[model samples]
Target chain A: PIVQNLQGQMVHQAISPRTLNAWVKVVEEKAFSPEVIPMFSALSEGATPQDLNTMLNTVGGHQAAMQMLKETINEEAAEWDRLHPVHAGPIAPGQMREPRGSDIAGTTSTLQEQIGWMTHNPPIPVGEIYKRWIILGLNKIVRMYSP
Target chain B: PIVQNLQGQMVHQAISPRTLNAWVKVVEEKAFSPEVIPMFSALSEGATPQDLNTMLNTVGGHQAAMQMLKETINEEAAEWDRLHPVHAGPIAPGQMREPRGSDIAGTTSTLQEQIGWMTHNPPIPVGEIYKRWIILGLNKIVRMYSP
Candidate 1:
């Protein structure tokens, strides 16, 4: 199946829905947040190096790229918190709750569970997450176009 | 002090010997292999994106780069094995010894110990290893030049 990348470029290599869904499942089950789904989907559907290059170019630079990601995660996490309200009572006596949305998914419920679970039960045997996906993908692209 | 990268390009971000030694210690303790020391050293000394670009270009491409890395690790592993001969005998009367040097540093003596040790005792609170150093460094470079 031919698919258009984030940059509207036609990608010859396309990913199956099954594969895409599996990644999405991993993200949700692993609590990586739903904000990064587009990235995973794009990569699954054969997002090209040119596509990523264009993204970084439009976003100003790496720092901006990261800032954008952080903002997106923050916004999504806020939305998630809004939708999933916690009914539990406050901490005992004088204890205070730390800031939220600082983790990958912005929820503290599954933070501990998400930490080292991948090592034992990796969703993909040979793959990386969204952040690493962009970096490593661009690296491969640079090497491909080197010279 | 200025330093030269793999491509002989002068790098301004020279790493201190103390920092370099710390990284080397992590690699050794982590069993990431001594073969990858040059890469660590180069990156530590502020290797430019252009230097990496030149390296990839000279090496043909990413596949070649990986091949070169693999070959280097294999050769170094062989040399390490020759220098540090295993004195232990076979497992059992029926069991056989598996191949060696498959892991990082080409040794199995510290393989079990190396795994998962980093999460609890990270040498650098905010950093990556050699393989990721190359990829993420290139990603940052591309982002820097994107425009």
Candidate 2:
């Protein structure tokens, strides 16, 4: 979780090796299409939204591409939750939240307004939807690794 | 710049110390506002777009906040270009481009469609604009460090 410095500026906690390993594992698994893992790798390597837009388009149209990415990420979160169920206790201060199935779904809902705009008429450029979709996907993985 | 592996996955070249120093320098300079430097540091430390949204709001409203960020980034590019003018020669394969004034401008234009939507009616959530603005700012700094 992010914290504020004395000056009130937000500071990001350094990511740990365990989280990084889990991240790599998610990217390596072939539970989804062959394209999914490579896409995750590309995002990890800091591929821009435009880069992802081109790559995702090759998989299918926007909806299908987003579905593939979303499903793969949701599945990984489900597996992680199963392996490590949340303990019944008060949450420690600053402790990162455990992975949950609803995390991505919640994010997607929060971003639905923009997603709808990107899909509708007078289209918001060619790649705006892809950028938001990529952000939604990334948020889940980042949550998985939050310190 | 991103490169393709033999397997066609995109790979990010590791950022260099010289570039990192330049990045830190840009953040440290107070040519704009005290808020700007810390904001850059926050982004460097992996602060999410939502984190930025809250921080930016403190500086002013969305327009003023974006202007501050855009101006600071543009000024740095100008200074970089002044210190190291582009050499007249054929660019080598995979050579990163020297900082140019128009890079951020170009990116903003590319994202204008979405920006407009975020600013208009039936708004695309509270923080959608901030996310795009943050991405634009990050793109400039990332370009400054590109290999």
Candidate 3:
């Protein structure tokens, strides 16, 4: 499934290995001959990690919104904590957009951290707010892994 | 550039070798990415070669009709030059179509013969029509050299 950011572009979820492999296999077998050809490659058209980031970010955003609404309604948490305390600056560090992944390395990215962290770390996976910001963030944090 | 066939379908013409290789050199350096991936098996909602073959055959049929009109003007020459003469009968050979080339020789194909025909013992160059018809004028006149 795909989610569109407020920007009206589809953000892809962390495309499962299962899905990507299925797509590769199909193209390899020429099942896409009508759509394309065996001579023309499929990987040239398949989804990218950025697509996954967009998808997962949209999912995480919805989850965060819901979590905040539920937390705000709870009597145990005060409204000030639920609502914004300061100017709506960037989302906090260590905040996640996706749910915790079973194998994801980062403690901060809700569900989207591992892939994003692999690219570059951002303070918040702002939902489609800025493509340039995400690209810059990927370049900055990705350096941690590259030799 | 694409050329439109008589049926109004676009078909490609092979480029002459000299200029084509130059373009291929420039195209090869780019990293490939594909937007749409094909299926692994020939089992999709609307895919596969057989389906395309059916569609193209229909288009080709339309084209053959127009070609037949042009060929009708040359049928007398075509029969004498291209085909073997037979006693005119109610079921004439002209009414029946003949198959050519190894496109249909899937049931019995060898790679060497597929490449090229070599000089033969009798010094006979291969003719265009029916070198392998079990019972035909060419079968008697021209011998099939086992290359």
Per lDDT, the best of the predicted structures is: 2
lDDT of 1 at A61: 30
Ranking by lDDT: 2, 1, 3
lDDT of 3 by residue, A21-105 (tens): 5444443553212322211122222233344343333332234433443332232223323343444567567653332221121
**How many clashes (backbone N, Cα, C below 3 Å) per candidate?**
1, 0, 19
Question: Which ten-residue region of model 1 chain B has the weakest summed lDDT?
Answer: B118-127
TM-score of each: 0.24, 0.24, 0.16
Error of 2 at B140 (Å): 20
Give all candidates' CA lDDT scores.
0.38, 0.41, 0.30
Off by over 4 Å in 2: A1-147, B1-43, B46-62, B94-96, B101-147
- Candidate 3 residues lying further than 4 Å off, grouped into runs, are A4-14, A18-125, A129-131, A137-147, B1-26, B29-147
Candidate 1 residue lDDT tens string, A1-147: 234334544334443455445444443443223223333333333233333333334442346435555555556556545765655777566433332333324234242233222223332211123345444444444454346
Chain A TM-scores for all candidates read: 0.28, 0.31, 0.21
Best of the two (1, 2) by lDDT: 2
- Candidate 3 accuracy as TM-score: 0.16
Q: Which scores higher on TM-score, 1 or 2? A: 1
